[PDB]
Design a protein around this ligand. Structure first.
Ligand SMILES: Nc1ncnc2c1ncn2[C@@H]1O[C@H](COP(=O)(O)OP(=O)(O)O)[C@@H](O)[C@H]1O
Ligand SMILES: Nc1ncnc2c1ncn2[C@@H]1O[C@H](COP(=O)(O)OP(=O)(O)O)[C@@H](O)[C@H]1O
Ligand SMILES: Nc1ncnc2c1ncn2[C@@H]1O[C@H](COP(=O)(O)OP(=O)(O)O)[C@@H](O)[C@H]1O
Ligand SMILES: [Mg+2]
Ligand SMILES: [Mg+2]
Ligand SMILES: [Mg+2]
Lengths: 518, 44, 536, 518
């Protein structure tokens, strides 16, 4: 009978299944063109405010596009968390998750195997794949020169698909030099992205020290040699006194004029407390009123106001000092030193450029381009590069790229496919064909024949060698160690683990219950 | 010679690139008149 | 305005206008929208297109005219291209797709020249001088085939027959359709090999069977059974006789009555019995007339009577009913008989002659279709085409119709040229050579027509999946190296860009008609400045 | 520039092939359950007057269901031609032609094969396919007893698919006798199937004579013997002369009394000419009025009225006489003979039973079933059974079925794929693998394995045994000559040619144009 209500779509075991698989096909065909170095970027047009967005990342493509399909929402969420974990490889999760379901659609229809039996093949196949992925890795970080070279290769492999593919030889130095300056600290908040219109893509230059978009006061000078930097999370504004609930009872206005004299004398004594250190600049988090601003003139102190919360830590780590608010004891809180405090102009906005600091634990990537859509792509491209290289510092193991990681994992899966009895061995081989489909797609986006290079790569690796890969520039098999293509071990581990869990969730479905929308 | 090594599927990118080119050139035709000393002014 | 309603033409607010450069961009882009439909269809590696009429019926076609004919359009520029493809389809019947792609190629190259500020009349005059110059060159380089005997002249039709069948439906049995197409013209032809009548051969399709079941039969196709099927289905001739002695009549078997409305008054019982005698004696006299004439099979236009059918069964005389007048025109020419109006003028000299009459089922319950066959050469051939689908046999009709039309063009004397992209490139390099000394203001006009002719080879390069620039570079360098101009694009990959080895031939009259209709339409579209269109 | 009018759906991209390919897959999967002996019947709900229809044939199903896809019309039209041509194998064409497009889908997407290459392989693959049937056929024309046994096994094969799988042992003798009755007349219109609801399904019979749907008019007897049959298509009732301009100029009503008497005298004279033959039964197709009916009573002649013109053809051939008109010449005219005539009752409607006729060039079948729906299914069955057996007389060559016909084609098709080295070999292998699916769905409908059971049939034929096939009652390989199932050569030639040419249709599309509905 009718059990749900009006305007409620229900499906049962032939409409429920084949609606998620066609949704997995629908979400996978979109991100098929974005995979690889020769991939085309997708343009997203918003429904409101005529906001356009040029982006190559599969997560950002799925963030903006609305998708009412429940099966596609699983692919939307797994690309979100994959961007949260590593930052790169979200497209490979969506492609590998869709092709695993594309293969499983045939095993359910053609071979007539239960869904639970397909998962049991994927559990053993995924275990054999990760064991081969663990053994195929190589140690690093024992020699800093090799660790420097591998980060350059990882930056080249990451930016090969983004808009920086042509200038990756120059941006690889910019990407890897900033990470080594972190001194092991894994955090992306210490890197600023300043948007500048004009120039070309290769005009991005490496900055010595730290640069930000702020300005001096009204009366401050242009240049001060060997300036001492201080950072105040203070209120140099109308301080009030903090026992909110203070009011001023006044019997006559004679003492009220002397009361206002005490307020000016209160802040004068506070600025006099600043001058005991003998600093040359003063950085405040919030706005500085004019009366503090005039007092820094005769004392020879620079003033910078309205600093962001991230900018405090980003500037303090480069300075080396600590944020001070009390200003009571001059013994502790040793401040840094900067040689050149002179500002420069890049475009129509002046920026305060620093140089010759104690430490460079925070950095700033200056970018140049034509359109803001390209700068947004430049931001997302290097954010994925810096995110992968930053996690490579903590996780040392890496694995060869260029499609060799997919085929070398499928070798152990195919080896373990023969000794497994029952119908799940076909599902173990279906997992192998899913790994083979990634380099099949890399040849399709490049416009070369896919069946020949996959057949040559597959026959070559079974001979005994395990260093061969796809060279899409020449269109043939080549040595990946010569070209210098390598990726992190946690990236491909997260992709295979996320794709295995992606197929597992959607394969354990039998009914769809879509309640009424609000 | 023929029927080998490829077949170009998904020609909609070719159709989309043509639509974007003629769309950009049609906007450029209105801006083209304002070039040089003998150009004209535009009121919007 | 000055406040009053300033109106000039009726329905002022409904219709619009368009002028300046924006009117031109609407024209060229409208041609590119139609050219993209035709560009992926042209050549042997093309793909049909499927059309849907308003009545639900579909037609799977790859002939530019039938596509554009059943296409509901709004833009007038495409509606002129609808008629251009129909113009090529009616007279020549070959190159509809070409005329369309080629006219767009002239229009696409004209867009760049309009940006330079050349007046459209100088553009149109340039293509007119270039078109006649290319026709004057191609008329000199092509060779004549009339010197060869009839045995080799049959092979030239097989060269063009395989060219026309390919790129179309029934590619599987195209070797037999070429022989069947050539065998149809061997029967129907003039002794001087000139001005053959195309109306003698009609098209007839049958929904059923397979393509392999199609064969040649010289006769008429009637979609009806014999009257009162108790007789044997397959009637045979006598032992000694000239033939079956076919008889045709445009008079129904009845008593003779006036054509005007009449009132036969019977005022007595004796006259009423004479009416019964008059009723029976007319049917008795009627069957005795056809008996003495020696006819075996009788064809009646306006049908007959229950009482004469029996009289027809006992005398071993098959007959039919409801035979349309158009079919009787086909029966008299096939069997070489004269249709008698009445029985008083019945004579043995007017009766036709054919080999045998028989009928088959083609399946379970569909319909009994009559078949006739001749024992020698006659002036009528009826193609008996079968098909597994209604769209297959429908496309096979217009495909074989174009095949007979291509052979019809070769009946005209000294009109042969080797196609395959060779005719386009060989007419292109000479136009660019003339521009080097005939520079003037129209130097870029010749270069536009030179680049527009080469697009059809590049269209074949896209469908075949080869590099266009490498193809046109090799063909252009080969034409400059050697003056032998029968090398074209090797679409089917048999090696040999040369075209005599691959047995391909196009009509010369068809090829020059490509640039004529393309140039003649481009001269018209470039004249349009104001575009006034009313709302539906 | 939108050249088309308003509401004009056009698809000039990959969605056009996807929309055309998914339409055939939907039509293909719709008929997968109807194939084989264990297949399930389907139910049709009409939109007008609630007139239901139960039918297993795919031609009646697809013609009844509405489908707006242009690809669906090709599958509808190829099934209509197969239903009209042979009368059997329509679902095999629908499922095979859809599977050829299904197998051709992955070549377009995964391997990226040209559409002209796929059809080019199907040309050479179909040529080798029909050549396998040329050598695999057997001519049983030399012996009538073996040909009599061949019509049994063909009736066993055709009737097993419908609801008459149990009663096919009894109707196989009924079916073959009707064909030997017709002695080569392949016209199916010469068999009258009288529909009777009620009684057991096995109560059908085949009487040696022609059974009328009507009875005697007023007083003519039921039981008679040694009756001479005379057939007429003659008005024979109130004769309106051939010219309608006739009139009577009546001067007095007494003379008009003689004119109406004269109309009775000529009718009395016409019936007097009927008595000169010396007959006991007279039959006319027009309904007989009262006045000529009365004159047959004194002469001792029976009268039957309102016979249909299609029944006069059956009536003339069972009786063996001739239809006579213009009765002045009884010498040249011929009349039939019969031993006994008796009126019977089967249910509520009475019928006339004829038995002991000389000529046996036709017959009538009386079916019995629980519902009009079962009776309809039954009818449709014997029509498909008798249609195949009728064409078996003109096409004596036969082919063994049960998965052996599809596999012996694939044995020759796979052999020819090696001598055509290049990219065309994948297309010919796709044509081979499409033929493997017909015995797969035949195994899936019965609930057996799709891979192992087909694998045993694969190995059995290449060992050198060209008589092995599937046996569904036990689920194992058995000999086809012992089981006794065989099809005609025209059937297997038709479905291979129809399914092959059907694949050529929807592989050359590259655009779908939809005008407005009217
Ligand atoms: N220069 C290159 N040469 C060959 N293969 C490459 C190259 N750069 C990247 N790849 C391949 O592209 C695949 C996906 O790259 P990735 O950076 O993850 O793209 P996305 O970020 O869009 O997922 C990897 O598996 C890798 O093997
Ligand atoms: N078998 C073939 N080999 C080489 N070229 C061919 C072949 N068949 C057709 N062509 C070429 O393809 C071109 C387009 O022909 P097509 O578009 O099929 O005819 P139409 O325009 O009359 O429909 C012609 O110029 C012809 O030279
Ligand atoms: N008892 C049986 N044993 C083995 N095979 C059978 C048996 N009954 C039917 N079959 C097979 O099932 C198939 C039924 O085909 P059918 O349903 O008649 O096709 P269609 O309905 O399209 O005419 C036949 O090819 C036959 O070989
Ligand atoms: Mg990446
Ligand atoms: Mg043509
Ligand atoms: Mg059947």
């Amino acid at each position: 009978v009718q059990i749900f209500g009006d305007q409620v779509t229900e499906e049962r075991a032939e409409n429920a299944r084949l609606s998620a698989f066609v949704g997995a096909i629908a979400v996978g065909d979109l991100v098929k063109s974005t995979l690889g170095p020769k991939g085309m970027d997708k343009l997203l047009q918003s429904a409101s405010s005529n906001t356009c967005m040029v982006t190559n990342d599969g997560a950002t493509i799925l963030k903006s596009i609305p998708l009412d399909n429940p099966a596609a929402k699983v692919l939307v969420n797994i690309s979100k968390v994959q961007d949260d974990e590593v930052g790169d490889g979200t497209t490979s999760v969506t492609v590998l998750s869709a092709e695993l379901l594309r293969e499983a659609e045939k095993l359910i229809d053609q071979s007539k195997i239960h869904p639970q039996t397909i998962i049991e093949g994927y559990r053993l196949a995924s275990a054999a794949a990760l064991d081969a992925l663990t053994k195929a890795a190589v140690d690093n970080s024992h020699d800093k020169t090799m660790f420097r070279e591998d980060l350059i290769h990882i930056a080249k492999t990451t930016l090969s698909s983004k808009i920086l593919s042509q200038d990756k030889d120059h941006f690889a130095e910019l990407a890897t030099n900033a990470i080594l300056r972190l001194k092991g600290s894994t955090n992306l908040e210490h890197i600023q992205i300043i948007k500048i219109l004009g120039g070309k893509l290769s005009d991005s230059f490496l900055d010595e020290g730290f640069i930000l978009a702020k300005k001096f006061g009204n009366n401050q000078p242009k240049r001060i040699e060997n300036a001492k930097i201080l950072i105040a999370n203070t209120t140099l504004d109308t301080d009030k006194v903090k026992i909110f609930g203070t009011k001023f009872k006044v019997d006559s206005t004679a003492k009220l004029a002397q009361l206002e004299k005490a307020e000016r004398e209160k802040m004068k004594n506070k600025i006099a407390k600043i001058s005991k250190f003998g600093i040359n600049t003063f950085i405040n988090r919030q706005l500085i009123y004019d009366y503090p601003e005039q007092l820094f003139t005769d004392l020879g102190i620079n003033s910078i106001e309205h600093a962001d919360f991230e900018g405090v830590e980003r500037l303090a780590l480069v300075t080396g000092g600590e944020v001070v608010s009390t200003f009571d004891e001059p013994s502790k809180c040793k401040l840094g030193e900067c040689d050149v405090i002179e500002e420069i102009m890049l475009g129509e906005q002046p920026f305060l450029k620093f140089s010759g600091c104690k430490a460079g634990e925070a950095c700033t990537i200056v970018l140049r381009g034509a359109t803001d859509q390209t700068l947004d792509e430049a931001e997302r491209s290097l954010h994925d590069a810096l995110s992968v290289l930053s996690q490579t510092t903590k996780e040392t193991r890496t694995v060869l790229g260029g499609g060799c990681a997919e085929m070398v994992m499928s070798k152990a899966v195919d080896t373990e496919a023969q000794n497994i009895d029952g119908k799940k061995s076909l599902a173990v081989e279906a997992f192998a064909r899913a790994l083979r489909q990634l380099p099949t797609i890399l040849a399709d986006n490049a416009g070369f024949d896919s069946s020949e290079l996959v057949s040559k790569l597959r026959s070559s690796i079974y001979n005994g060698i395990s260093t061969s890969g796809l060279d899409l520039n020449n269109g043939t098999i080549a040595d990946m160690r010569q070209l210098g293509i390598v990726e992190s071990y946690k990236l491909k581990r997260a992709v295979v683990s996320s794709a295995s869990e992606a197929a597992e969730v959607l394969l354990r479905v039998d009914n769809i219950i879509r309640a009424r929308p609000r | 010679v023929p029927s080998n090594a490829t077949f170009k599927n998904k020609e909609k990118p070719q159709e989309v690139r043509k639509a974007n080119i003629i769309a950009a050139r049609s906007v450029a035709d209105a801006i083209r008149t304002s070039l040089g000393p003998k150009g004209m002014d535009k009121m919007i | 305005e000055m406040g009053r309603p300033f109106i000039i033409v009726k329905d002022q607010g409904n219709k619009k206008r368009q002028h300046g450069l924006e009117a031109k961009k609407s024209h060229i882009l409208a041609a590119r929208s139609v050219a993209s439909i035709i560009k992926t269809s042209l050549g042997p590696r093309g793909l049909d297109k499927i059309l849907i009429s308003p009545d639900g019926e579909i037609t799977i076609t790859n002939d530019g005219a039938t596509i554009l004919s059943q296409m509901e359009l709004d833009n007038e520029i495409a509606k002129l291209l609808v008629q251009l493809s129909k113009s090529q389809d009616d007279e020549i019947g070959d190159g509809t797709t070409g005329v369309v792609v080629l006219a767009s190629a002239l229009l696409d190259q004209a867009l760049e020249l309009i940006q330079k500020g050349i007046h459209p009349i100088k553009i149109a005059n340039g293509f007119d001088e270039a078109a006649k110059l290319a026709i004057s060159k191609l008329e000199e380089t092509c060779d004549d085939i009339s010197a060869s005997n009839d045995e080799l002249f049959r092979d030239f039709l097989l060269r063009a027959a395989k060219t026309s069948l390919g790129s179309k439906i029934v590619s599987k049995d195209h070797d037999r359709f070429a022989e069947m197409a050539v065998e149809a013209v061997i029967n129907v032809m003039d002794k001087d090999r000139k001005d053959v009548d195309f109306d003698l051969i009609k098209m007839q399709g049958r929904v059923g069977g397979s393509i392999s079941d199609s064969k040649l039969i010289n006769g008429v196709i009637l979609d009806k059974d014999f009257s009162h099927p108790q007789m044997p289905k397959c009637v045979l001739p006598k032992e000694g006789s000239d033939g079956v002695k076919l008889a045709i009549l445009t008079c129904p078997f009845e008593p003779p009555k006036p054509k005007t409305k009449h009132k036969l008054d019977i005022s007595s019982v004796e006259e009423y019995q004479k009416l019964q005698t008059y009723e029976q004696d007319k049917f008795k006299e009627m069957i005795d007339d056809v008996k003495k004439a020696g006819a075996d099979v009788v064809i009646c236009q306006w049908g007959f009577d229950d009482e004469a059918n029996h009289l027809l069964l006992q005398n071993d005389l098959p007959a039919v009913r409801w035979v349309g007048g158009q079919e009787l025109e086909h029966i008299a020419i096939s069997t070489n008989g004269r249709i008698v109006p009445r029985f008083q003028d019945l004579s043995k000299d007017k009766l036709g002659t054919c080999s045998r009459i028989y009928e088959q089922e083609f399946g379970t319950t569909k319909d009994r279709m009559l078949i006739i066959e001749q024992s020698k050469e006659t002036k009528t051939v009826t193609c008996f085409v079968r098909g597994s689908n209604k769209m297959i046999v429908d496309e096979a009709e217009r495909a074989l119709h174009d095949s007979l039309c291509v052979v019809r063009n070769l009946v005209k004397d000294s009109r042969v040229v080797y196609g395959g992209g060779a005719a386009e490139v060989t007419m292109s390099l000479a136009v660019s050579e003339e521009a080097d000394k005939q520079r003037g203001i129209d130097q870029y006009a010749f270069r536009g027509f030179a680049q527009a002719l080469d697009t059809i080879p590049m269209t074949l390069a896209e469908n075949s999946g080869l590099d266009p620039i490498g193809t046109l570079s090799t063909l252009k360098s080969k034409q400059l190296k050697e003056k032998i101009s029968n090398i074209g694009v090797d679409c089917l990959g048999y090696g040999s860009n040369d075209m005599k080895e691959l047995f391909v031939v196009d009509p010369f009259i068809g090829k020059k008609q490509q640039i004529l209709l393309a140039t003649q339409l481009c001269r018209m579209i470039l004249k349009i400045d104001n575009v006034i269109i009313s709302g539906k």
